[PDB]
């Protein structure tokens, strides 16, 4: 009956779910377990560039904390 429609909807649901989960996890993998930083304004990009210089491995997601000080 009407439940027979459900399997196609479920396959479509999985297919639609795949890209969002893929994007989230790819961002996590590329940005070191943190969300990809969002730079909608030049100040945020300047912060990202400063982090890249500070990291020393030329990767912004690498974060240097109080340990680098003194």
């Amino acid at each position: 009956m009407w439940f027979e429609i459900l399997p196609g909807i479920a396959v479509m649901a999985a297919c639609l779910f795949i890209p969002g989960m893929a994007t989230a996890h790819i961002h996590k993998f590329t940005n070191g377990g943190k969300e990809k930083r969002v730079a909608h304004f030049s100040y945020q990009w300047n912060l990202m560039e400063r982090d890249r210089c500070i990291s020393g491995v030329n990767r912004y997601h690498v974060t240097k904390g109080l340990e680098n000080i003194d």
Partner: protein, 96 residues
Amino acid sequence: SMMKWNRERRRLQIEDFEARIALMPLFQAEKDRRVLQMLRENLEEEAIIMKDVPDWKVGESVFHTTRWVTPMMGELYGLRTNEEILSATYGFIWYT
């Protein structure tokens, strides 16, 4: 509900802008030092480059005014690597 939440959002935006204000002087000092160091490196490498060229002053200002002019991207990153140049020019535009 939207009025309440938007007022709170503007409050949080004011807070974040205040944080940016607090951090701005340090960034200005760092930027000024970086710009001056890059210019000095360019000038030294330029003297080495154009020592043999006749009638070339090194580091002669192109403007008549004896006033600081913010250097263009070309002055600062003229002889750096292409990756640095691409970053400095198009990083914010391209980053998504």
